[PDB]
Design an enzyme around this catalytic site. Structure first.
Site, short mmCIF file in Angstrom:
data_model
loop_
_atom_site.label_atom_id
_atom_site.label_comp_id
_atom_site.label_asym_id
_atom_site.label_seq_id
_atom_site.Cartn_x
_atom_site.Cartn_y
_atom_site.Cartn_z
N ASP A 24 31.35 47.09 54.17
CA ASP A 24 31.96 45.89 54.36
C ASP A 24 31.48 44.71 53.53
OD1 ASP A 24 33.72 43.73 55.36
OD2 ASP A 24 32.66 43.90 57.38
N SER A 59 42.14 33.57 42.81
CA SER A 59 43.26 34.22 42.03
C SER A 59 44.01 33.20 41.24
CB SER A 59 44.07 35.05 42.62
OG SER A 59 45.20 35.64 42.11
#
Length: 330
Positions: free
Chosen positions: A35, A199
């Site tokens: 994770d 992004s």
């Protein structure tokens, strides 16, 4: 040193991936959920409330010659899906795909929430976010990656998740045969403890790319892709019959619909998520209505590039002094 381990979906939807991890001496192999959005390595154990154990493999520290109880230490964690676990703390020898860390904090669960109990395939979590998020008290403990770092050939690990197939976690090296084209690297902020990046935008199917900054985290422990409501609405508007359902809890669509791809930007590069990756199947057994793999992050407080996005890429988690993330198509 290096390590290389295969990671395997737990079910036919890629809800999560499990990776075998050797703990203790002789080794006890548990299948953990790697994770990159948390920083605790915790396991079902001989100490876990019996009624809360249902098919998982447990760690038994008393059968390990190298386990040591970290005196007085406790841990307690709550995850974004609302699940939780807690207990006490051992250190022991932990190996992943041939890479061994001595004195790794292995957090033994005394209690776990029902979603963990009900998932027989996951024996615990192995956190790969930054150690600032580790929940051990009174003294925070270091992640497996952080402990291994100085020993690694290169201070990196890579995630190569499969679509309805196994994939690979590598430590200490970049497998140049595992991706097409080049890796584009992008800056990371560690201010919130996550592999947080920006992004450069998105496209829906064959549409033109929209340049826009989308702050988010690269999170292998989250199933879906969670993005701003504007973006997500733009995507589902291109799917016939799709709608957001508050009762179901997200965007749903006719299972027979053809889904467009979804592109996200990494600097001037582009990662394309095929339409198929965005189908998470019937909302309930037998339904002709399907659940979407791209959902709104509104209410989460952070955008999350989870498995739906990451499995479309070869992803480098670069733990150098100034960390970065790399993305390649594959």
């Amino acid at each position: 040193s290096t390590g290389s381990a295969t990671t395997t979906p737990i079910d036919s939807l890629d809800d999560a991936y499990i990776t075998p991890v050797q703990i203790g001496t002789p080794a006890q192999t548990l299948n953990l959920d790697f994770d990159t959005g948390s920083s605790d390595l915790w396991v079902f154990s001989s100490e876990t409330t019996a009624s809360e154990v249902d098919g998982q493999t447990i760690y038994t520290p008393s059968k390990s010659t190298t386990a040591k109880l970290l005196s007085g230490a406790t841990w307690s964690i709550s995850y974004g899906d609302g699940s939780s676990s807690s207990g006490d703390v051992y250190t022991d020898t932990v190996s992943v795909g041939g890479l061994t860390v001595t004195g790794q904090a292995v957090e033994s669960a005394k209690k776990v929430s029902s979603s963990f109990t009900e998932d027989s395939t996951i024996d615990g979590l192995l956190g790969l976010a930054f150690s600032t998020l580790n929940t051990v008290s009174p003294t925070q403990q270091k992640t497996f990656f952080d402990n291994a770092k100085a020993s690694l050939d290169s201070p990196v690990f890579t995630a190569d998740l499969g679509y309805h197939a196994p994939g690979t976690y590598n430590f200490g090296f970049i497998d140049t045969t595992a991706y097409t084209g080049s890796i584009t690297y992008t800056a990371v902020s560690t201010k919130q403890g996550f592999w947080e990046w920006t992004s450069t935008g998105y496209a829906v199917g064959s549409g033109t790319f929209k340049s826009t900054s989308i702050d988010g985290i690269a999170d292998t422990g989250t199933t879906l892709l969670y993005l701003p409501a504007t973006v997500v609405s733009a995507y589902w508007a291109q799917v016939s019959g799709a709608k957001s359902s508050s009762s179901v809890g997200g965007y749903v669509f006719p299972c027979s619909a053809t889904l467009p791809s979804f592109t996200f930007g990494v600097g001037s590069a582009r990662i394309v998520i095929p339409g198929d990756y965005i189908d998470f199947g019937p909302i309930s057994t037998g339904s002709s209505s399907c659940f979407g793999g791209i959902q709104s992050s509104a209410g989460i407080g952070i955008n999350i590039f989870g498995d739906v996005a990451l499995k479309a890429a070869f992803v480098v988690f670069n733990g150098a002094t100034t960390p970065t993330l790399g993305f390649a198509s594959k």
